């Protein structure tokens, strides 16, 4: 009663090199399903962390580097490109040769960098203005500093577009960074530093005197105000409820209730609009509705900003960009990064030229890349198989909601209805192979030259941005794909309501045609339900069928929601994590995944209990002593399998919403009372306590 | 009738990964068992070549990374050397502080180096001689520049030990490169450009003026010089034959036969002897024996040496040595090296940190580091198993004697005594860790500073030539291995008559006492019959079963070795390599270990048949529709699955008495009628010519 086929094999031996018999399962299921990966392993110089989701990557940038690498004779216009995109980016002798060059020929366009730039005032500061300066980073090359002005769908109308406005991002991972104490320190100290090398190379290259002094005088000056831009910025945790973040004013009101004294001016928020818009050459008017995302941020902005002069808010305005380029300049430019990617990553080097290269042009071309790589690596006979698990995670959903005590049955049909209008994408969009005029003219307004990797860059940056600018008046098209087939992950849209399986994570350990069921469900069907979940989650629940922000939950539904999940917020935060320097993890800011994890997880189960129900029971995998029910839950962990750079997790627990994968493992198992019945786990073990959350 | 054990379907399963059915057995049997794994991987930046070998020997730097980063409360002495020598390696920030001061504070004991010092002839030149010199590189550094004087086994007495007299090793890969253009151009340009970056980085620390035409004129001298050095060296072709390398003279017709004026002297062999030798205070006399391997090398030196300065001499002598210090200085030092070893190897990066010192230590503590590694990867059992095979695979060598119609009766029962005589090795030697004071004693001499990891270096360079300086008296130690355990690797050494297996090599895909038989003679077996063979290739067929230089061979048996030989010199002189340029493998420097590859292959064969004979046949491995014949030989061509960087094939053509992997397979197999035979292979199909090379 045994299988004995080559593709389980395969998986009996991974599962085997993977797991750790000698741990007790009931008393730590990553260790169990994942030590003697962990035994194996180091993380590589290049790497921040290192698993299984980081090794799929790596290997799916081979898949890119073949395709990528050869030109063809029969490539269409698109892979043409595409091509030559890459061999650019991988010519290091040719970006070598130019040294800083290219970036000194774009420091006038920004109004220059004042630290390596003499007389900056007689030269920039006299036109100098706010609202042309933030704006030309905007429009020009994306790069959105002190105000955040954005054209993105209307999340209270998902056919729709609507100019935003929110608190930027910042130099340093997160705002509790510029603490710049303890665990910050060393991030603090590379940062400055790595602006004070950079102004020194500009100098150096410009023939300028180099006083180190005043370099440090400027560049602690650039650090001081962005200290107190990210004290002014909102908390991850007091922008989770997108009801409340949602703001629409005109900009008649905008102009009202959030003035700027900018240079001692005031700040023309019409002006701004249109100096972004005109780009694009779309005219606004003060009475343009605009979603306003940080109130509060714009507020605390207006005392900060009067204290410093034109020359101190350029000073970290183009070091925000520069610090972005520095890495597409010669050697020189390259090296002086090292110490700062190291304090927030703990890599103590950069990944091969061809994996960064491949990388780029499958991020900057998905259809032209995602193509080339479905040809290359991915069956058309998967996508069905897919389809039809979807089909059924979708279906114990809806039978779920039944079971469900804490919903009434008015809010359970509209869940119904969300669920029901769920979009599914599996793969790749059919129109990426059998379209080449649609492919060829997504790309017609770039021209890539072979010896010019930095014009390349720069083209990239413009036409993006051009590209979303340009979307203001225009609809939302319902047939876009949030995500190229070239990517080993899942995705979730809010205002689609869509479900996103690109071709890249349809292979072991997630899925196979040829795998066992249990390892499909635990896999793929656990990240099909995560995907479901998301329209469900403390964020997705406000959204409708169409993707709109609209309450759809009676008041005792949705007090009901936020009881049953404090249960997570509690459980994750009291997750210490030892590489994180024994920090607890954000329970509110992981609560969404924690949920989409543990709901995701019990679809999955429900959905294989059907599938045995059905059809039998599986044949069981040769060197393995385990059962089927218990082979879910292996390979579901599995998936997991990883260790962080104690740099890394610093930065993770901070910024990323998903718990790091050993606690989505721990916490998720802990809820599973089907888990501790496939391992026989005792009453209070570790891994079976008696209080168990559950929202979906 | 198929076997479902955990260790069979571990092993099916990297069987069937690395394997490609789509290619034919018969058409190419390196793409048929290795295309798969060729696919998936890529060779990595730090990597000039990889494959199963190099794998495993990454993943043993893991299990030394383990061992070595971990101080222990109960660690004897030996051992906490071997974890404070890796504690200094691994602290960069400890070594980048000094710069290049180590180094600056050794170049007064070596008479400095000439281009990086000023006024060098007032300084240096006054007290300089060739002969002392050449002799502080040699006994303080062992460092061998211009003549390589050496303490080592007579050849003709392996009791004993005796002065040596050899052509010294040169600063590019082989002699081969100095003809500097095409294939060799980047080598020789990065080479100069080498000596040239450490120059102007010596002389800027020392505050001095750098004229770069200066550099580049001394530079070019010493590549000059070097180019001489390298065209008076003998071919490898023209030092495989033992006996005639093999010149026993006294220091008195040394000197008579051997004359060198350098810096007009003329040069002292006495003085220079005696200068390497008080070292160790030991006297030397004119009637002193030695064996002098370069006598035409020696004769054809005298008129390229009147034409330099001493000046020019110790440009080249200081900087052979510096060559090799730069990668344990400061990061610009280590920098200086890039351009260099990417010609020679085609990395693009140097290894982690963690792994270059794990290294290090292992190869400077071998005995400290075995024992560690031993504890933690190796179990003793295994130590019996490999016992048995080593002796099936000995018999079966004795066994074929008998059906080798190409030699005598006589030779037979003297290659007979040479088996039997084989001193065998296995995993490691006992004492290692049931011996604690013996371990200790061995490192007694050292002591190790952990924020001094160059003078940690400085001091193993003195110890290690102390230590074979003061054998010249002494007798040669039987109890020795000529390995540490902690070695993915095997070997024979000619003068003790002895095969090493290392732990290191004594697991999958080589050895498992749990996988199938036909895998473990397929693997390990072949590895045995290799160093077996080894005993009896154009080298080993020249020393008896005590390790002496003796004609054991009739003239007959002698010509007919020779004529069997020539074979698989047409053989494999015919294969043209790909990443090599198209260019031919050396059919003569890499006759031994193709010898050895063929003879071995087929002794372990006959000793798997012998095997079934007495034991029956194997359960057959799932998912592979192959019998056991066929899977030795997917095994044995596994153990090969491999590929290199264009620059290191280059670099391997000549310098590597191997054939590449892949030509190991093809040429073996090729001469092989037993694999045909398993593989049903048609008449002159790639894989099976009619004429087949036997030897062994
Ligand atoms: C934009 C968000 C997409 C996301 C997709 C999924 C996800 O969580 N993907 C990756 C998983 C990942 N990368 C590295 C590691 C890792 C490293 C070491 C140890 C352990 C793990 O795990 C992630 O962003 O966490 C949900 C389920 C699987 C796919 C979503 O829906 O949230
Ligand atoms: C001092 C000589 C020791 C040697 C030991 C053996 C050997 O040949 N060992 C290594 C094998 C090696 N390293 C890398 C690769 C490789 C990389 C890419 C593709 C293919 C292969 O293969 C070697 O030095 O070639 C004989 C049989 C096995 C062990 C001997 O007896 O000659
Ligand atoms: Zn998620
Ligand atoms: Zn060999």
Redesign the interface.
Same mark, same amino acid.
């Given at each position: 009663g045994?299988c +004995?086929?080559?593709?389980? $094999? +395969?998986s009996?031996?991974?599962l $085997?090199?993977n797991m750790d018999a000698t741990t007790e399962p009931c008393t730590d299921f990553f260790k169990y399903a994942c030590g003697g990966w962990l035994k194996?392993?180091?993380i590589p110089?290049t790497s921040s962390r290192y698993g299984n989701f980081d090794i799929l990557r790596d290997?799916l940038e081979?898949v890119l +580097?073949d395709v990528l690498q050869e030109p063809k004779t029969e490539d269409i216009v698109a892979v043409q490109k595409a091509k030559a995109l890459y061999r650019s980016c991988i010519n290091e002798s040719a970006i070598d040769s130019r040294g800083g060059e290219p970036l000194l020929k774009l420091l006038p366009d920004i109004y220059g960098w004042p630290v390596a730039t003499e007389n900056w005032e007689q030269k920039y500061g006299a036109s100098w203005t706010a609202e042309k300066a933030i704006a030309q980073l905007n429009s020009k090359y994306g790069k959105k500093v002190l105000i955040n002005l954005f054209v993105g769908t209307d999340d209270k109308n998902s056919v729709n577009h609507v100019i935003h406005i929110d608190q930027p991002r910042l130099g340093l991972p997160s705002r509790d960074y510029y603490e710049c104490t303890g665990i910050y320190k060393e991030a603090c100290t590379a940062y400055v530093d790595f602006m004070i090398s950079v102004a020194r190379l500009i100098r150096q290259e410009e023939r300028l005197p180099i006083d180190e002094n005043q370099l440090a005088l400027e560049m602690n000056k650039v650090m001081e105000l962005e200290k107190e831009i990210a004290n002014a910025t909102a908390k991850p945790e007091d922008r989770n409820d997108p009801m409340l973040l949602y703001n629409k004013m005109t900009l008649a009101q905008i102009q009202n209730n959030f003035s700027l004294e900018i240079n001692g001016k005031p700040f023309s928020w019409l002006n701004f609009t249109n100096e972004i818009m005109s780009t694009v050459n779309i005219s606004i008017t003060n009475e343009e509705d605009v979603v306003v995302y940080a109130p509060e941020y714009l507020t605390k902005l207006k005392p900060i900003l009067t204290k410093y002069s034109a020359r101190d808010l350029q000073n970290l305005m183009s070091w925000r960009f520069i610090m972005d380029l520095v890495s597409s300049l010669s050697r020189t430019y390259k090296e002086s990064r090292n110490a700062f990617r190291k304090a927030l990553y703990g890599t103590?080097?950069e990944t091969?030229?061809?994996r960064r290269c491949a990388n780029y042009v499958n991020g900057n071309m998905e259809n032209a890349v995602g193509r080339l790589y479905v040809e290359a690596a991915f069956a058309g006979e998967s996508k069905h198989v897919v389809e039809d698990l979807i089909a059924q995670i979708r279906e114990v959903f809806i039978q779920t909601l039944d079971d469900l005590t804490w919903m009434d049955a008015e809010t359970k049909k509209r869940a119904e209805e969300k669920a029901l209008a769920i979009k599914e994408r599996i793969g790749y969009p059919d129109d990426i192979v059998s379209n080449d005029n649609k492919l060829n003219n997504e790309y017609l307004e770039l021209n890539y030259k072979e010896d010019e990797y930095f014009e390349n860059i720069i083209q990239n940056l413009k036409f993006s941005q051009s590209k979303q600018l340009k979307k203001l008046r225009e609809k939302v098209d319902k047939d876009e794909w949030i995500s190229g087939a070239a990517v080993v992950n899942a995705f979730y849209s809010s205002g689609r309501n869509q479900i996103v399986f690109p071709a890249g994570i349809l292979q072991p350990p997630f899925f196979s045609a040829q795998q066992s069921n249990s390892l499909n469900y635990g896999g793929i069907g656990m990240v099909i339900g995560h995907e479901i979940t998301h329209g469900f989650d403390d964020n997705g629940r406000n959204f409708n069928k169409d993707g709109d922000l609209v309450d759809w939950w009676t008041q005792q539904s949705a007090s009901n929601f936020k009881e049953q999940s404090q249960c997570m917020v509690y459980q994750y935060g009291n997750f210490s994590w030892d590489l994180a320097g024994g920090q607890h993890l954000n329970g509110i800011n992981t609560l969404g995944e924690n949920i989409a994890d543990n709901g995701g997880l019990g679809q999955a189960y429900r959905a294989y209990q059907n599938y045995i129900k059905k059809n039998g029971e599986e044949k069981l995998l040769?060197?393995?002593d385990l059962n089927h029910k218990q082979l879910f839950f292996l390979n579901f962990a599995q998936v997991w399998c990883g260790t962080y750079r104690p740099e890394y997790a610093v930065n993770s627990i901070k910024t990323d919403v998903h718990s790091p994968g050993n606690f989505r493992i721990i916490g998720t198992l802990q809820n599973s009372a089907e888990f501790s019945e496939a391992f026989h786990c005792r009453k209070n073990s570790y891994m079976n306590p008696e209080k168990k959350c559950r929202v979906w």
């Open positions: 045994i +004995k086929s080559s593709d389980c $094999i +395969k009996a031996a991974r $085997i090199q194996r392993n180091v110089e290997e081979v +580097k103590t080097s091969a030229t061809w040769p060197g393995l």
